[model samples]
Target chain A: EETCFDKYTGNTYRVGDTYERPKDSMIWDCTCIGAGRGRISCTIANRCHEGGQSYKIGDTWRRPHETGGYMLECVCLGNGKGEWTCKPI
Target chain B: ETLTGQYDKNLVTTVEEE
Candidate 1:
């Protein structure tokens, strides 16, 4: 049988915009900082949901339902396809 | 249990503009 995997979405924003934490967004949420146009550096706090395979820099993941349930961060970048590099922290 | 692959980054090669 084929192995099963969970899925996740990602999102991007400028420095002033808010970083919407995920439903499972914990202390180790995938936080990213801007790296000019189409580039970013995403910091992994703890083990992300779906084994860290569900989140990316430019994708839009769903936010938790409860208000203020998750922490928030901000970033800024240039135009074009937003790109980011992920590293284990 | 496995969720739908639609949200899977691996399966999703085309990223829409946000």
Candidate 2:
């Protein structure tokens, strides 16, 4: 069974396999760590990019209500090289 | 696996069977 299904790329990955997701701006370091049953855990490999800017892991940014019509805060979150995540604050 | 042919040309799946 396929261990991971990348919805963005429609690529199926089995355990112990490594795949690069350049469309997502990720590197060749995603290690599938679970079998087909649910979502699997994999190592993310790259910084988060948003609004034409690049952000490193653990970086935080706040969105202004004046620009986006809403006040919100976002952070690059994950084990290391992570994804752009946001929340209202 | 099918290639979408958009990202890096070297991007491909590497499968290891055991």
Please, what's the RMSD in Å of model 1?
17.7
User: Poorest 10 consecutive residues of model 1 chain A by lDDT?
Assistant: A74-83
Query: How far does residue A34 in candidate 1 sit from its true spot (Å)?
Result: 2.1
For model 2, give the interface RMSD: 13.6
Instruction: Give the lDDT of residue B10 in candidate 2.
Output: 43
Estimate the TM-score of every prediction: 0.21, 0.36
Model 1 agreement with the true structure over B1-18: per-residue lDDT tens digits: 111222224332222121
lDDT of 2 at A51: 64
| DockQ of candidate model 2 | 0.03
What TM value does model 1 have?
A: 0.21
Can you list each candidate's DockQ?
A: 0.04, 0.03
Best by lDDT: 2
Q: For candidate 1, list the clashing residue pairs, or say none.
A: A10-A59, A10-A60, A11-A59, A14-A75, A15-A75, A15-A76, A28-A46
- lDDT scores for all predictions? 0.30, 0.50
Query: Docking category for candidate 1?
Result: incorrect
